[PDB]
Design a protein around this ligand. Structure first.
Ligand SMILES: Cn1cc(-c2ccccc2)nc1CCc1ccc2ccccc2n1
Ligand SMILES: [Mg+2]
Ligand SMILES: [Zn+2]
Length: 313
């Protein structure tokens, strides 16, 4: 009850900032998550014994893949923490509880392959989940872990509150399918620009939570340049492996996944910032003004990729 998690002074201060990097000490990550849950939600939100046991089962069910790994799960949870903490009064008790767990669980048992590759391979999961294949799987794994003995962190919620929190987590995880982001943001764009956006409209909250999930998921682009640049290596390590597997199926991959076209990376990064990242943090900054530092950091990183193409680095 009176057992608080306390970080060293540099982490205690920097963790409140959007561009915080969780560091290379894997054994500190669970404690960092618990710290964030306690400040974001409260020390009474979860039983510490169950929470700690949930965290370690989630960790065990992330694989040793270059990018879509346990570090990614905690990083995305930390972007969510920073959004919630800078928007104190905009979110319910259930939403703060669910969204931190949603972020931690959002890539559970990821294999380092896209929905497209599961489809072309004809993987069993592609016949079970025709669309947002991996994202339905991540949610399926989340329910299964919550259903392990002494793992039900939501046990002190009522039946209605429990169903509500699992519906928040389900929508939040499905929303991390980037295929769904483009239409979600367009609708948010129209709703903001015609002034019809209403945060007491459940269907509108869902969309806004959705864009928050995309923003947290892409948050590598919002770090200081050295972190962004080194994370890109891990991102392309998965893509190129997938491109290798494409070539094994007798399918030339897209250039993004073809290691033979490494040189085009800087230009591919420009497109993704202009097509995906900047639009995402822009719409998010309009709806939630205090998330402006993500847009700013993302613009700074866009400029760094522009400097790479100009051979300045
Ligand atoms: C779209 N596109 C195409 C290329 C590309 C094309 C040809 C040759 C090399 C590359 N690269 C990308 C972006 C890759 C990418 C995808 C998701 C990300 C999420 C967070 C941070 C960085 C990310 N970067
Ligand atoms: Mg994912
Ligand atoms: Zn992710």
């Amino acid at each position: 009850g009176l057992m608080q998690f306390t970080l060293p002074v540099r982490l205690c201060k920097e963790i409140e900032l959007f561009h915080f990097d969780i560091g290379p000490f894997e054994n500190m990550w669970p404690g960092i998550f618990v710290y964030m849950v306690h400040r974001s939600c409260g020390t009474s939100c979860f039983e510490l014994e169950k929470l700690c046991r949930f965290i370690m089962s989630v960790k065990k069910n992330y694989r040793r893949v270059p990018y879509h790994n346990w570090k990614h799960a905690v990083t995305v949870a930390h972007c969510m923490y920073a959004i919630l903490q800078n928007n104190h009064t905009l979110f319910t008790d259930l939403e703060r509880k669910g969204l931190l767990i949603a972020c931690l669980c959002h890539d559970l048992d990821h294999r380092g392959f896209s929905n497209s590759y599961l489809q072309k391979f004809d993987h069993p999961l592609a016949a079970l989940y025709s669309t947002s294949t991996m994202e339905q799987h991540h949610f399926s794994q989340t329910v299964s872990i919550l259903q392990l003995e002494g793992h039900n962190i939501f046990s002190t919620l009522s039946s209605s509150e429990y169903e509500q929190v699992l519906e928040i987590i389900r929508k939040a995880i499905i929303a991390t399918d980037l295929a769904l982001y483009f239409g979600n943001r367009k609708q948010l764009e129209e709703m903001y620009q015609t002034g019809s956006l209403n945060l007491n409209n459940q269907s509108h909250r869902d969309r806004v939570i959705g864009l928050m999930m995309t923003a947290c998921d892409l948050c590598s682009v919002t770090k200081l340049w050295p972190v962004t640049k080194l994370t890109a290596n891990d991102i392309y390590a998965e893509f190129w492996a997938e491109g290798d597997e494409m070539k094994k199926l007798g399918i030339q991959p897209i250039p993004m996944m073809d290691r033979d076209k490494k040189d085009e990376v800087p230009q591919g990064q420009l497109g993704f910032y202009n097509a995906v990242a900047i639009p995402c943090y822009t719409t998010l900054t309009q709806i939630l003004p205090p998330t402006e530092p993500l847009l700013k950091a993302c613009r700074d990183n866009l400029s760094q990729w522009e400097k790479v193409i100009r051979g300045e680095e």
